[PDB]
């Protein structure tokens, strides 16, 4: 498809894996999307959502890695 939403939908396969492999490098792909939400905030300024786009971006980025690593923690 080619959309940010895909990254969040694919995250399920990362945790569902429950193993140690390419899943580690797969996360890198998600981190790339994080810049998509930032660019929108940077290009802007006088936007109420711009504040949420960044806050939510820096969060989901650290969160996605938390659950993604869970596989190893298992």
Automatic annotation (TrEMBL):
Coiled coil: none annotated. It is found in: Cell membrane. It comes from the Eukaryota. This is chitin synthase. The chain holds residues 103 to 171 of 910 of the full protein.
């Amino acid at each position: 498809m080619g959309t940010i939403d895909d990254a969040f939908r694919a995250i399920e396969r990362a945790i569902q894996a429950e193993n140690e492999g390419r899943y580690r490098e797969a996360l890198k792909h998600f981190l790339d999307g994080g810049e998509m939400i930032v660019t929108a905030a940077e290009k802007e300024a006088s936007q109420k959502v711009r504040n949420l786009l960044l806050h939510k971006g820096k969060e989901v980025l650290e969160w996605a890695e938390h659950l993604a690593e869970w596989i190893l923690e298992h």
